[PDB]
């Protein structure tokens with residue numbers, strides 16, 4: 263096809279990874295300025311993980327119960343607090359590798375890079391898309407919690423994900439960096455289930471724009487649609503409805519190709535209703551939904 | 564199951580920008596030497612048949628502008644090793660990792676740090692194709708981007724980017740400046756030899772699909788090594804060697820599926836197709852995970 267999942271370079275995030283241990287439970291934390299962020303379930307024994315009372319568990323803890331290490335080197339904890347599902351550990355050293363950063367809460371469909379880490383040590387980097395059911399298809403083993411997802415804009419690292427759990431079907435769930443879960447999940451070792459997933463329409467449209475940019479445009483029809491008519495049809499094919507924000511983020515690709523967003527929607531609608539009829543797009547009979555409009559521009563330009 | 568790249572930070576701290584005339588690309592700064600593609604020294608009227616030794620002897624140290632961020636590094640010497648230029652600078656890179664230069668075999672995988680103007684832009688996993696191309700994502704200005712693997716603290720550099728072929732695949736050198744494949748650093752349209760599929764890697768990925776509970780493509784049958792290889796060659800798959808079978812041992816043990824059993828399942832896929840089903844999300848048989856890749860990620 264000429265497209266591939268591409269992560270951002272991970273070095274600026276690698277420089278922020280530490281390990282956090284409480285008892286024998288070690289996970290990863292994110293060290294920015296003089297604060298380390300990590301999943302609050304580090305304070306849980308395996309027994310607590312069944313039905314933890316986090317407020318009560320935290321009361322029993324003191325600064326001297328947290329072992330924070332950058333590599334083998336201990337970072338002294340001088341303060342702690344809980345913000346939703348993340349623990350914030352104030353430390354006595356500002357991280358000299360702290361990048362320009364911010365904390366962002368993403369929407370389904372947005373992609374980000376994951377720096378998978380174990381014992382504070384990066385193992386691999388790969389791109390994930392936040393699914394409409396607020397799960398990601400990660401590659402996470404025991405000890406991966408506290409690994410983060412991020413995007414990089416110029417010099418600024420936008421942190422959008424911190425890893426907390428795996429679901430029965432093998433997909434993954436987590437929080438933003440303010441500790442608010444994506445989706446209806448809770449940090450308890452209880453049976454939970456991912457909602458039925460849907461196709462990320464805005465990313466499929468980005469994919470069709472990519473195909474057009476590359477001269478593959480058999481599927482462009484002469485018709486258009488309203489956003490409401492398109493949304494009602496799309497849901498019948500298990501595609502997500504479009505938001506105004508989706509229409510807006512397709513703006514640049516619409517301008518680059520001269521194909522109005524609602525005209526592309528009518529072309530997609532015909533593909534949904536009539537199928538590919540044996541044809542391919544960018545070399546495939548399957549439509550791709552894990553490239554955002556930004557991902558497309560990045561790899562086409 | 565995720566195609567996973569190595570963390571790129573150790574390589575990012577080595578990337579610099581190299582400019583000669585109106586040509587800019589990337590260099591790799593290790594200790595006091597910057598490595599980059601030699602075609603940086605070529606002008607327009609040079610690129611079609613460049614007599615590189617002749618063009619290089621006519622250059623001075625000051626013709627090369629090297630920048631690390633906002634800082635210019637003074638070139639105090641230069642030499643050429645095959646298709647790579649080595650620029651000696653007056654400063655050591657303190658971010659130089661432990662490293663080695665390796666020449667990888669077809670079928671082996673590596674991470675690419677794609678860079679533009681000395682700035683890292685993206686990281687992804689690639690495999691050396693049997694025809695010695697790589698299916699990369701590289702645009703104008705990407706030359707000098709490198710491919711690498713990481714072992715403990717040691718970066719093994721295996722690839723430096725030089726060119727795109729008309730089919731959209733890519734070609735480059737090892738860090739001794741020798742091309743992978745029959746390609747030449749001149750501005751001409753070059754075709755590669757017929758590519759084939761990396762069979763040992765397809766098998767590794769089928770084991771990965773089982774390990775993740777996807778086992779619809781399995782069958783009860785078995786095959787001999789030679790009969791499988793006859794079918795593989797027919798379908799433009801690479802031969803499977805006994806070393807490959809042995810390399811696949813751990814994945815075999817993990818799943819309790821003998822290698823030649825999985826070969827029989829792959830034979831069925833080749834002859835019957837996937838029938839619209841998918842494996843690990845893919846409509847196609849994936850051949851850019853090595854056995855090591857699969858094991859390291861499932862461990």
Ligand SMILES: *[C@@H](O)[C@H](C[C@@H]1CCNC1=O)NC(=O)[C@H](CC(C)C)NC(=O)OCC(C)(C)[S@@](=O)c1ccccc1
Pocket residue numbers: 588602605610701702703704705706725726727728729733747748749750751752753
């Ligand atoms: C880095 O300098 C650059 C990377 C290329 C640019 C686009 N994607 C890449 O991967 N390398 C080159 O531009 C390279 C330079 C020569 C080795 C001196 N040339 C190259 O890759 O040319 C691509 C062709 C497909 C050959 S295009 O230029 C062409 C040439 C002749 C006839 C048809 C098409």
